[PDB]
Amino acid sequence: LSTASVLAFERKLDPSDALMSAGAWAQRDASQEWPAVTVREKSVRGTISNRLKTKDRDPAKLDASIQSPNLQTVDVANLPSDADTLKVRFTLRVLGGAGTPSACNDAAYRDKLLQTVATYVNDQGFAELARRYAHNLANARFLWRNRVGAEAVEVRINHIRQGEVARAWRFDALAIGLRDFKADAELDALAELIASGLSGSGHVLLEVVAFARIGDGQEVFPSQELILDKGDKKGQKSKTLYSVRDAAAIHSQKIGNALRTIDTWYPDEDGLGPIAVEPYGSVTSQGKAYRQPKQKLDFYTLLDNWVLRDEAPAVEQQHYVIANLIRGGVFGE
Template identity: 50%
Template sequence: MAQKNHTASVLAFEKKLVLSDGYLYGTQWHDRAQVTPLTLQEKSVRGTISNRLKPAVKNDPAKLNAEVEKPNLQTVDTCALSVDQDTLKLHFTLKVLGGVHKPSACNNAMFQQSYAKVARNYSEREGFRELAKRYALNIANARALWRNRVGAESIEVVVRVLNEAHKQSWTFNAHDFNLRHFDNQNDQVDALATTIAETLASEDGYLLLDIACYAKVGLAQEVYPSEELVMDKGKGKKSKVLYSYGENRKAAMHSQKLGNAIRTIDTWYPAFNDPEHSAGPIAVEPYGAVTNLGRAFRTPKENQDFYTFFDDWANGKTLPTSNDEHYVMAVLVRGGVFGQSDK
C-alpha cells in the first residue's frame, strides 16, 4: 500500500547561508595597504536611436532620418577606479548556520518527525560534504564578482574565519578554478569545505567568514556594483541606478546577488549534460529558475522540481539518486516557505 504524504500547511526554513552586502573599494594590485571606497558618479550622455522600429518607420527613409535626428538623452550612474588604481576589492562576510534538520515553522507534528529523521540521516551519511565543497569552490573562484570577473588579469580571494575560537585563513587564485564544474581538487578548498560542512551538519553551530576578492581590472577601469530595480523611473530621471550606501553614495553589491553566486551549485538538473540546452551551473531554486534566460530548468511536469522530491523524501521515500538528495538539502539551506495549502 502506498504511503500517504503528510505535508505541513505551514512550513518554513531559515536560510543557513547569510550574506552581508558587498562593499567596493579601489586599490593597487602590488600595494593593497591603502584602499578607498568607490563612489558612484552621474553621467549624462547623448546616445543614438538603436531600438527596433515599426515597419512604417524603418521602410520610410524620411521617417527613419527623423527618428535618428531625435537625441537619445540619458543620465546614468557609473562607477570606476581612480586613475592611480588598477584593482577592485569586493569585501563581504558570510555566516554559515547549522540546524537544517529543524524547520523554523511547522504545524504538522507527524511531518516534522518524519522530516527530522531523514534530514539527520542525510547529515550523518553525507555530512554536507558535497554541498560544502561546492560553496567553498564558489568562494575560491570569486563567482561573487559577477561581471567584474570578466577580463580581470589576476583575481585573488582571501578568506578568514572570524570565530574567536577557530582562527584560520586561506588565499586562492580564482583563475585556478573552473566556473563550469566542481571537479577541482585543492587542499585549501577542502579545508574550507570541511569547516563549512561541519557547521551545516551541526545542531546550532555558526561560522563567520570574512571574504575579500581582489580583481586586477586595469587603471581607471569601470567596475560594476549592483543595479537597483526602479519600478517607476519616470520622465527625466536616471535610466540606470546603481546600489550605494551612505551620504557619499559609496558603491556596493546586494547581499542577494552575492548569495545567488555562492549557491550557484546546481549541476544536477536534467539539461546540464545537454550541450544545446545546458546553462552550466545554476543557482539552487525550487523550479531551477534562471530569470535572465526566462526559463525554469526543473519543472513539475518532468518531476524534477523541489516540491516533487521534497514531499516524497521528507515522508521517508527514497529518491532516485543521491544527487536529488543533495539538491533538496541545498534548497533547504537556501531557506524559504514551503507549506502546502489545506484548500
C-alpha cells in the same frame, strides 16, 4: 500523510553587502584604509538603437529618430586610474541546524522531515555541499559579471571567531576552474571549516575578500535599483547603481544566490554551465524553465517523495534537496 500549510526555513549562508574598495600597488598585503568605489553620475546622449518595424514606408520616423533625440543620465562607477584591484569585501555566516524548520505547522511532517534530514546528515556528510560551496567561494561566481576578463581574481577568505585573524589564504580564479568539482588540500581545509559550520557542530564567520584584477580605472558594475513612474528622464531614470554610505555596493540576495550551486543534474546539459539552486529550477539569466513539474526533477516532487511518500531519490537529487532546504524560502500551500 501530507505536508503543512506553511513551511519556512532561514537563510543559511547569509551574506552581507559588499564594499568595493580600490588602491595602489603592494598595499594589498595589509589593505586596511583604502578608499572605496562610489556611485557617481554622468550624462549620455541617447540616440536610438532598438529594433524598428520592417518596410519603413514613413520618413517621419527617419526624421524623428535623429531630429528629436533623447538626453538622459547613466551613472558609471569607474575605478580611479591610480588603482587596479576591485577589493570586493563582504562577510558570510552559517547558522546550521538546517533541517530544523523556522515555522512549520504539522508535527508528523516535521517529525519525518527531522529524522530524514538527520538520516542524511549523520549518514552522508555535508562534505559535498561544503566542497561546492568552497568552490563557489574559491572562484568569484558571487561576482556575477566582474569575473570576465581579469588578470588574477585573488580571493582571501579568512576565519574569525574573536578579534584577530587566523591565517592567509591566497588563491586565483584562473588556476581554479570555473566549473570543476575537484578536491584540493587547502580548499578542503576551508571546506572542512564550512562543513563544521553547516552541520551544526559549531559556528563560523567567513569573510570573503576577492581582489578582482580588472584594470587601472576599468569600469565595474554593481547592481541596479528600480524606479517608478514618478520620475522623468532627467533625474537618473535609466540606471541607478546600488550604494552604501559614499560607496558602491552589491546586494545580499544576489551574492546569496551566486554562492549556492549544487544542482548540476538539470536534464539538458551540465556542460553548458551550472545553474543557481531553486525549486522549479529556473534561470532568469537565460529565462528557461528547467525542472518542469511535468518531469520529476521538480524539487517539490523531490521533497514530497523523500519525506511524505517515503521513496528516496538519487543521492545527487538529495544533495539538491538539502541545497534548497538550506537556501531558505517559503514553502507549503
